[PDB]
């Protein structure tokens, strides 16, 4: 085990004006051609998704992608009220692999039901990793990778209620968020989620959370309050900040046979004055562009918080963007050959 300079490993094209390509060129580098994956024989490696510096390396690194390409018109840190430029951009995250340098290789937990902290049996070793889309969001984890056998619950400390719980799903549920054209508030948008698919997943999640809380009861309520970014589903859709009210997604009403089934349309809005996930402060952007704005994402995860005799109430949480990267780098670890 060790902790080294894990360099950004790209897959970008040196001629696209898309902002995730014009940043990988500068920080990331080309990928390893034929990546190694030899199955380590009779090996027991201990992992900790909450300590793997790959999370720190990425968080520190993803910040640079937003500073370079998502400059807000006005930043409002403590005291100073800085101004700069607001060029509208082409925005669509591209995957980032994290190769290791010579002397160190990445151990990859190939277990199906490993929860995040403990031993992995089927341990392999690789140079790069599978692609990671740098999607910043709250409550729901988008455009990731799915679980392989069952839904897995990942929490650094379940008893510590203030810790966010990560739910990794075994089947995806697409979410199609759209700001329509003249078809009229240009700041108004909506997201469509399959109610039949979603409630079946929530039911599966509801059944899974029983096994971790002594087979008791489950309740999904809406967040208490505070910043919109955590009380609503927030994400960037092609340079536009979306905030979507997820009251209809976490509706205990629809986890028997009633009026579920139908399409779940969430009222969303496009904020210009948003809170910064870089650090403490607020920023301000420009109003949206002409035409259609579309984002067909894939809910591959859910970020939940607990209030903490019987019932156990949960809330859509998130906020700590470090945990977004922990939903994709849990199966990786850096050691050393020398």
């Amino acid at each position: 085990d060790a902790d080294t300079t894990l360099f950004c490993a790209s897959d970008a094209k040196a001629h696209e004006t898309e902002v995730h390509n014009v940043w990988a060129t500068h920080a990331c580098v080309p990928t390893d051609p034929n990546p190694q994956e030899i199955h380590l024989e009779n090996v027991t490696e201990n992992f900790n998704m909450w300590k793997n510096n790959m999370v720190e390396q990425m968080q520190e690194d993803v910040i640079s992608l937003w500073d370079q390409s998502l400059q807000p018109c006005v930043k409002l840190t403590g005291g100073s009220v800085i101004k700069q430029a607001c060029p509208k951009i082409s925005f669509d995250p591209i995957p980032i692999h994290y190769c290791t340098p010579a002397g160190y290789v990445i151990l990859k937990c190939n277990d199906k039901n490993f929860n995040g902290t403990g031993p992995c049996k089927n341990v392999s070793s690789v140079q790069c990793t599978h692609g990671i889309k740098p999607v910043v969001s709250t409550q729901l984890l988008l455009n990731g990778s799915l679980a392989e056998e069952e839904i897995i619950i990942r929490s650094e400390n379940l008893t510590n209620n203030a810790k966010t719980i990560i739910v990794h799903l075994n089947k995806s549920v697409e979410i199609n968020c759209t700001r329509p054209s003249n078809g009229g508030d240009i700041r108004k948008a909506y997201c469509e989620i399959n109610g039949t698919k979603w409630n079946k997943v929530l039911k599966q999640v509801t059944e899974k959370l029983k096994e971790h809380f002594n087979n008791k009861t489950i309740i999904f309520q809406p967040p208490s309050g505070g910043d919109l970014e955590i009380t609503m589903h927030s994400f960037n859709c092609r340079g536009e900040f979306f905030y979507c009210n997820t009251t209809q997604l976490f509706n205990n009403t629809c986890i028997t046979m009633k009026g579920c089934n139908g399409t779940i349309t969430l009222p969303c809005k496009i904020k210009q004055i948003i809170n910064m996930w870089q650090g403490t402060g607020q920023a301000m952007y420009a109003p949206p562009i002409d035409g259609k704005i579309n984002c067909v994402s894939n809910i591959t995860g859910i970020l939940l918080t607990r209030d903490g005799t019987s019932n156990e109430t949960f809330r859509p949480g998130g906020g700590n963007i470090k945990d977004n990267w922990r939903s994709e780098l849990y199966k990786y670890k850096v050691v050393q050959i020398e």
Partner: antibody
Amino acid sequence: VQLVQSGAEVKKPGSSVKVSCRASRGTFSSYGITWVRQAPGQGLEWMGGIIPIFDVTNYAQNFQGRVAITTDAEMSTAYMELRSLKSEDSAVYYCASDSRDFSYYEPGTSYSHYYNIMDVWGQGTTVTVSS
Amino acid sequence: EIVMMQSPGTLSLSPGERATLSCRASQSVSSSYLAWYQQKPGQAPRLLIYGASSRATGIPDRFSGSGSGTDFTLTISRLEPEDFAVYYCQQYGSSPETFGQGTKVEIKR
């Protein structure tokens, strides 16, 4: 997009009027609103205004303590209540918000000017305080 | 507060000639925040200049606005029959956002 005022109201000394300002499209989310008045044969007189970047609402010392600016929930309609009327408050009450709100994106204009620029104005709510 | 003394009260000119109005501030203003308005006695006022120099949406190019600090000026290259009205300036940097007293662009005859 234009702002829709309340009607011309005749009030009595010691009463309280509340003027409306509804926007056709969009909201007042980013730059907000600002209230202005003009007495008969006088100049303009700043009343108050919402500044949504600082999340503050402020008035002047001539009108503070008895003037309150409110909005809706989504900031599509804003109001102005003036408790304790007087013949000195007989005037025309106006309403101004920013045009950079909605519209779209101008190549074009500056969006790092966070203060409300007040280019979309109201119809005018002529208010007469008499007995 | 910031008193905003404009000058003069009435500017007597004939169409085609140049008009130059002056808005002086008692204290300094964040130069980027001063606006000019125009009220034709009969309807509502409207924006002509914001940020001391930026024209409002759709204002003719004959309307030049400039200045900084405490010395501001609204310039008109050539008057037209749709410009003889009252003009106001407004600081809106540090509240209270006070207005000026007014300036009537009169027909000289």
